[PDB]
Write a protein that binds this ligand. Structure first.
Ligand SMILES: Nc1ncnc2c1ncn2[C@@H]1O[C@@H]2COP(=O)(O)O[C@H]3[C@@H](O)[C@H](n4cnc5c(N)ncnc54)O[C@@H]3COP(=O)(O)O[C@H]2[C@H]1O
Lengths: 349, 349
């Protein structure tokens, strides 16, 4: 959905006075055909008859005017009502796949002038917005809320399985018994989880102000998942990898590439052709995840720590004095690192 | 019914563009509250909100605008539509005998402003017109046509009886055997016939263009009745009476006074007590009726003939030579008088 169309869709999203008027119109089963233009004079060839109003916009005014047949013309910023009861006459030769005089008119006029035209039939509860060559059907809140609520419920389920996988991976990581299969399984679940978020995004945007709670729920459920996934990529990829490369790996699996076991392992730098092989590849975390998340060690400085020790296992075998031999690590960083790892190994294993 | 009010009625009578619109409004069961003013700027105290239109009036525009709630404001000559969807706020203290917000509003505004206010309820088919302290309910054509058709059919009956009484009196006149009862009976039916005409007149006016055939029918039926009644009064009044005085006698019995036997005989100049005495009084026609309607002799000249011969009876016995001794009667008029009378006697008696 082009950013261009997205901007127009906001004009009729829950929260706007315009949308408030369209909802009333739908609730009353009145129909509507609205043409948005800033300079009516320039479009006098497509606008016939009706009443010249040139008055300040209001949702109540639009609703009342919609009781009359014909079309209403508003300024593009929806601050002025120019005409009411007009006959819109776009070029008949313009191709259109719409049905009925009202929708065929709206599409042709939108294509012809490059402006927005809103159509609402009396029988249905949807709002059809035509811009240029785009057509976007806007749904009622009830339909959206239902879809969004089910998606959120679905996400809770994915997140729960994700936390179960992560907790088990945590134990293995601390015991240095991690296999490629363990990592791949955790990443795949994390990728699948973030995909759902991406897919439900448009519904939430279309919800406008009625999507505030939904946004809060999504944020609470996926708060630190992206970072966590990036750190897993950095900790288990075949060879050293930057936070940028990892972040890119994440974006690829959430959209383009499909999160399949082999595909994920392959992108991580492992040469595998069968899923069964995964349980045969032993891997060791570099330590980035634990250093940043638990030890609260900045990634930049973390590269230094991994530079010297290579793996979390070797980092947990170092002492305060030993750890301080790394640039950026003082008695404080050294303590945080050492104490945080030792504490986890005692509580988790 | 005041003339200043009859003028306003014409504004919504069948045939006008305004009435065409109101008929449609009624057919669609839309309601209507129309305010007719000349200077829109001067009523900012009773007119609130709505849309300023200042556009040319048309029946279709009014109809379309009546779909919205509220009132419409038109110019007094029905050439412009000033406002639509407005809230009318007349003084609440002004007395009103109307029921419902719309009609109470209409009567108050008309009284407060001295202007015309038209109200139409959604459920009923009558147009209520308010002007100053007047209220006139206009009916649909179908209701008016039924009443008018009945009245005409009734007039046909009275006219048929008038014609029979007239032919009977004609015989009696030619034979000089007329009694006051015969005269009064004929005049009575003639006064009753013209009264019916007077009572149906407002129905005819209210029919507007749709009353053309009705008017033609009333004219054909009562054509020369008035003249005939005036001539009878002149021929049978106790003492010589001027035409104007006869016409005034007619006007009175057609509106004010009641055409009862004794009453008519009284006004004719005969001192009668009981209606049974009428058959006892013998009277002789002066001759005006026959001289003017049959001999085509102007009243100014007929006076001369009566002045000399005194009665139709004597006139019928006068020779051409005798008649030519009268001022205004030459060989031509003498022949016409003599021949027209001898012809009637031969044919009728
Ligand atoms: N001051 C008041 N006191 C008690 N009830 C009140 C009221 N004001 C409004 N209402 C109630 O609301 C109903 C509908 O109001 P509405 O404006 O839609 O629909 C109205 C309106 O479009 C028109 N109308 C009435 N008075 C008007 C006024 N002063 N100015 C402009 N339009 C008026 O006639 C329609 C029907 O009138 P109706 O009385 O049958 O129906 C009224 C009445 O039952």
């Amino acid at each position: 959905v082009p950013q261009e169309l997205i901007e127009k869709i906001k004009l009729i999203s829950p929260g706007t006075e315009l949308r408030k008027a369209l909802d009333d119109i739908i609730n009353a089963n009145f129909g509507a055909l609205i043409f948005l233009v800033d300079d009516p004079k320039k479009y006098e060839d497509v606008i016939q008859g009706g009443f010249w109003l040139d008055t300040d916009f209001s949702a109540e005014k639009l609703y009342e005017l919609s009781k009359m047949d014909g079309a209403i013309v508003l300024s593009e910023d929806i601050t002025k009502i120019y005409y009411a009861n007009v006959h819109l006459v776009p070029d008949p030769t313009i191709p259109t796949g719409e049905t009925g005089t009202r929708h065929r008119t709206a599409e042709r006029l939108a294509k012809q002038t490059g402006k927005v035209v809103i159509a609402v039939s009396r029988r249905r509860n949807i709002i059809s917005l035509y811009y240029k060559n785009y057509k976007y059907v806007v749904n009622q809140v009830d339909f959206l809320i239902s879809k969004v609520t089910q998606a959120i419920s679905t996400l809770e389920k994915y997140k729960d399985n994700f936390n179960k996988l992560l907790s088990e991976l945590e134990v293995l990581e601390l015991e240095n018994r991690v296999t490629l299969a363990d990592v791949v399984r955790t990443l795949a679940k994390g990728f699948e989880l973030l995909r759902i978020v991406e897919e439900i995004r448009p519904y939430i945007v279309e919800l406008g102000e009625e999507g505030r709670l939904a946004r809060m729920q999504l944020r609470e459920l996926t708060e630190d998942v992206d970072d966590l996934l990036v750190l897993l990529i950095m900790d288990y990829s075949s060879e050293e990898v930057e936070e940028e490369t990892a972040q890119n790996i994440l974006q690829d699996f959430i959209t383009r590439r499909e999160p399949s076991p082999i595909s994920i392992s392959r992108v991580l730098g492992y040469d595998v052709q069968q899923a069964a092989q995964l349980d045969d590849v032993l891997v060791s975390a570099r330590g980035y995840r634990l250093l940043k998340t638990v030890a609260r060690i900045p990634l930049s400085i973390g590269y230094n720590v991994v530079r010297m020790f290579k793996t979390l296992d070797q980092i947990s075998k170092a002492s305060v004095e030993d750890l301080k031999k790394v640039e950026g690590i003082g008695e404080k960083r050294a303590r945080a690192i050492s104490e945080s790892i030792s504490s986890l190994k005692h509580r988790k294993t």
